[PDB]
Design a protein around this ligand. Structure first.
Ligand SMILES: *[C@@H]1O[C@H](CO)[C@@H](O[C@@H]2O[C@H](CO)[C@@H](O[C@@H]3O[C@H](CO)[C@@H](O)[C@H](O)[C@@H]3O)[C@H](O)[C@H]2NC(C)=O)[C@H](O)[C@H]1NC(C)=O
Ligand SMILES: *[C@@H]1[C@H](O)[C@@H](O)[C@H](O)[C@@H](Cn2cc(CCCOC[C@]34C[C@H]5C[C@H](C[C@H](C5)C3)C4)nn2)[C@H]1O
Ligand SMILES: *[C@@H]1[C@H](O)[C@@H](O)[C@H](O)[C@@H](Cn2cc(CCCOC[C@]34C[C@H]5C[C@H](C[C@H](C5)C3)C4)nn2)[C@H]1O
Ligand SMILES: *[C@@H]1O[C@H](CO)[C@@H](O[C@@H]2O[C@H](CO)[C@@H](O)[C@H](O)[C@H]2NC(C)=O)[C@H](O)[C@H]1NC(C)=O
Ligand SMILES: *[C@@H]1O[C@H](CO)[C@@H](O)[C@H](O)[C@H]1NC(C)=O
Lengths: 497, 495
């Protein structure tokens, strides 16, 4: 293990500096006897996933907040955590020297980093691209004889995905999402703006667009990459807005329902990629539960939909209970997944703030809220950006957990990276959220899960300036006496037998 | 009397051009004879509140969309419509030649314009100011011996308000809202950023701040202006945010509750201005219903609160039933009032002739009216073509854009979308039920005037023409069409 090398850029906390020869990392995981817990701590004051151990004791010395594990109250199983291999992320990572590239990829994908097991892959260009392109830009090619992957896939994204999977011990799930179709399939003839597929579900335009998904999966399969899932479209609501500035393709909930039932579902099912899952929506949670009611009440669409993908960016427009909670209640057998788990940079702030503790707290706060409202997994957006929050061909109000400074062969791990890691490292695929009861009203955010092997994990976030004395009770083991310091995040792990 | 002079700026529709000698206006209001209906139309294609009259048919057949009036299903009574006399609005208006000033004020405030009966007045400086003054900038002036109105009030706002009221036949209600206190009353000692009043409700800071509201009302009353209402603070949630870029003053809902109960409520009640009403919140409706529960479950605060003031940002959509609807349900005797609205860092701050931005206005007013809201107040009455001035460059759009170099002003689609409501819904109008016979792409709302006559506004946000009928059981069937990208106001006598 190597500790964080801290650097301040004048914001509330520090980044951890990595270069060709040095990056902070963990020892292989190693968990103690019954009656002992492990704690990992990160603080605004500068501690970065520091390990300590202590006792779980028969006697309860604490008189403050008590959180009681309720392992018999069982909720969702976790699919996992990761981020997006955009053109921008791949260009940033590949501009480091190879030893630094390897340390950046280990930070995310190795058991000695934070154990990512999901990668989201754009299908061709988006805002985080240095140019507009699709896989089939030659028009009137309805059989897609001229479908092909450019250098962005074959030179940048695919090689980095192979390297990410080689570093990971955990199986990695790939998720694909398209932003735009070829412009000759669109009503507006442009990559952006208000525009849908020409014609109507069932017709040659809709069949061609469905076939493009299969051509995409074939091309990645020729490069020894298989997908867990695809989404029906990235932010389908964007393509219904006049002047939408970057790559989009508009679907009303009804058009998504009919495109899935008539074209995309049957096309995937008749292909060699019939095991690939399909997620719907891939858009703001305020569109729930309406979008889920329109698509999932039609059995011919429902039979092809494995899950509902939600984006965080505009979460402030509607609370979790009315959107995620109501959707689960109405469709309890369709998983919820956060496919774009990134937060907006307030208009009076720069897109990248090196060392922002606040932006880290926004990530851990949203993951806890999601977990308390049935969500099974998270993909962050860009795995890495440059210090301007690019490259991007339009203009964006977003940060990234890793910021690459090409000119110094160095990369900076943001507080966001450690806030993600407090979940991603310690919540493997198949972990199950369980009860955790607060004894009294409190200012903490907390969640409990049980690993597949039955061991406990609890994450405690303190977004307040005040230290909160805390007891955690495991009925099977006893009492964990601890403190949640102001502006801290803790992950607690223990054996239950 | 005078039609729109259209001008394209290359966007989806036209502005109407006004100058020192010409502005579009209406004839004095008329009412259609019993058995007939009036229709005012505005279209993306360029019609601007064009008047036509049709017959009310005793019979109707067909499977086409029917909207049926439920005159016995009675909802909220309307307070009115208007906008804000900011420093920026007044500076722009007073840079026109006097005759052009007069035609701008008539456009909004005359019976021959769109009949505004609300003006929102900032208490000292906001982002739509060219500097950052309060009325009491002498440090630690707890007795407010150096309280005074600067030229922004005495030379720009007050004279324009007097002129607006002189033009208006309808009584006008003035609404006052502060953005910041003096810096010496604030924890952070700055007009902007994260900061709340120093100390605790009941203390010298909180009593001085409450006495500042009385000094404001005293000074406006010396200038023969009286207020209908004040808000407890503009966007109190803003001053809880670190780096908040312009004038703000942070309150939690608990802090607002306690400031009203201990200081602002009693101070106003013991003053010569006790008839002035107090609105709480004055902020974005996502804070509802929690903010209303915190303040209004405390009877010591509730007894001082007349209403809940809401804001929205029209490029976004928010739930209305869960915020406005649930608030009305908990607190049905406390009116909801929309005190600020406006309109994509990619599009300019001002898009001269944007039909889209017009439809965002009328959609928002219909949404609000369908969820108990009694009034709807635009932001700046007028801005320059850059969307200014604004000392932090927080430029936005306005229904009237002043071109000082040309002694010209442009009435945007927003002005006409607003007018379709403000001109035809007098104070005291009551919203009534209006049931659709089938799912449809139309926004519609029905109200009855104090005198019993009917008004229906219909907006078509789709590109498709929609045939429809309006049924009023007292008179019969109004056969009509909503063209795609149109807004219509219908008027008829019921007896
Ligand atoms: C203020 O705006 C008004 C209205 O747009 C301007 O009045 C208009 O002046 C134009 C001059 O360009 C007139 O156009 C010409 O009219 C003559 C006489 O009928 C005709 O022979 C020409 O073919 C041409 O159309 C227009 O009639 C007139 N409209 C009205 C109602 O007066 C006015 O010039 C503007 N004032 C300033 C200072 O710019
Ligand atoms: C998710 C998306 O799929 C990614 O492509 C994108 O990079 C990412 C982060 N993001 C968004 C932005 C700027 C905001 C884009 O406009 C949003 C919008 C859309 C309409 C409604 C509302 C007001 C305006 C019109 C602007 C919000 N920068 N980075 C995610 O969006
Ligand atoms: C009202 C305010 O009192 C005026 O001083 C100001 O000039 C005016 C214009 N305006 C708009 C904005 C911010 C636009 C985006 O903010 C984010 C947002 C958007 C909605 C959802 C959520 C809560 C709010 C509504 C704010 C996040 N700044 N000034 C008005 O603000
Ligand atoms: C990569 O970062 C590491 C750690 O910050 C740097 O290693 C330090 O190098 C200096 C020599 O200038 C030593 O005195 C320190 O003891 C080193 N620290 C450790 C822990 O090894 C290294 O300099 C960096 N590389 C570059 C090119 O700057
Ligand atoms: C404050 O008022 C006093 C007394 O009336 C006056 O002499 C002084 O000029 C004022 N201060 C400012 C800054 O205007």
């Amino acid at each position: 293990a190597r500790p964080c090398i801290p650097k301040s850029f004048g914001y509330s906390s520090v980044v951890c500096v990595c270069n060709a020869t040095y990056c902070d990392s963990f020892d292989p995981p190693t968990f103690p006897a019954l009656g002992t817990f492990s704690r990992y701590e990160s603080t605004r004051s500068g501690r970065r996933m520091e390990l300590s151990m202590g006792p779980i004791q028969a006697n309860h010395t604490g008189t403050g907040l008590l959180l009681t594990l309720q392992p018999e109250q069982k909720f969702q199983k976790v699919k996992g955590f990761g981020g997006a291999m955009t053109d921008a992320a791949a260009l940033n990572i590949l501009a480091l020297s190879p030893p630094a590239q390897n340390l950046l990829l280990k930070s995310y994908f190795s058991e000695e980093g934070i154990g990512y097991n999901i990668i989201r892959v754009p299908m061709a260009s988006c805002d985080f691209s240095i140019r507009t392109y699709t896989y089939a830009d030659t028009p009137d090619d309805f059989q897609l004889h001229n479908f092909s992957l450019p250098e962005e896939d074959t030179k940048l994204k695919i090689p980095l995905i192979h390297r990410a999977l080689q570093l990971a011990q955990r199986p990695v799930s790939l998720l694909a999402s398209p932003w735009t179709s070829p412009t000759w399939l669109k009503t507006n003839g442009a990559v952006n703006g208000k525009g849908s597929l020409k014609g109507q579900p069932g017709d040659i335009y809709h069949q061609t667009w469905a076939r493009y998904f299969v051509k995409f999966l074939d091309a990645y399969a020729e490069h020894k990459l298989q997908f867990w899932a695809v989404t029906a479209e990235n932010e389908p609501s964007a393509g219904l807005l006049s002047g939408y500035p970057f790559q989009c393709l508009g679907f009303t909930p009804e058009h998504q329902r009919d495109f899935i039932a008539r074209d995309l579902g049957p096309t995937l099912a008749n292909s060699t990629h019939h095991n690939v899952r399909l997620l719907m929506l891939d858009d703001q949670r305020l569109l729930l539960p309406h979008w889920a009611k329109v698509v999932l009440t039609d059995p011919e669409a429902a039979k092809y939909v494995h899950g509902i993908a939600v984006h965080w960016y505009l979460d402030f427009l509607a609370p979790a209970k009315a959107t995620l909670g109501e959707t689960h209640r109405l469709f309890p057998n369709t998983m919820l997944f956060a496919s774009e788990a990134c937060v907006g940079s307030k208009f009076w702030e720069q897109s990248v703030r090196l060392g922002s503790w606040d932006r880290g707290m926004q990530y851990s706060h949203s993951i806890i809220t999601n977990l308390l409202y049935h969500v099974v997994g998270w993909t962050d957006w860009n795995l890495a950006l440059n210090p301007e929050g690019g490259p991007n061909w339009v203009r964006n109000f977003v940060d990234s957990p890793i910021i690459v400074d090409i000119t110094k062969d160095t990369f900076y791990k943001q507080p966001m990276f450690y806030h993600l890691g407090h979940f991603s490292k310690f919540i493997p695929e198949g972990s199950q959220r369980v009860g955790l009861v607060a004894s009294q009203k409190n200012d903490l955010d907390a969640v409990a899960l049980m690993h597949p092997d039955g061991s406990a994990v609890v994450v405690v976030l303190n977004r307040s300036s005040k230290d909160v004395p805390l007891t955690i009770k495991d009925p099977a083991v006893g009492f964990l006496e601890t403190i949640s310091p102001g502006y801290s995040i803790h992950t607690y792990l223990w054996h239950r037998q």
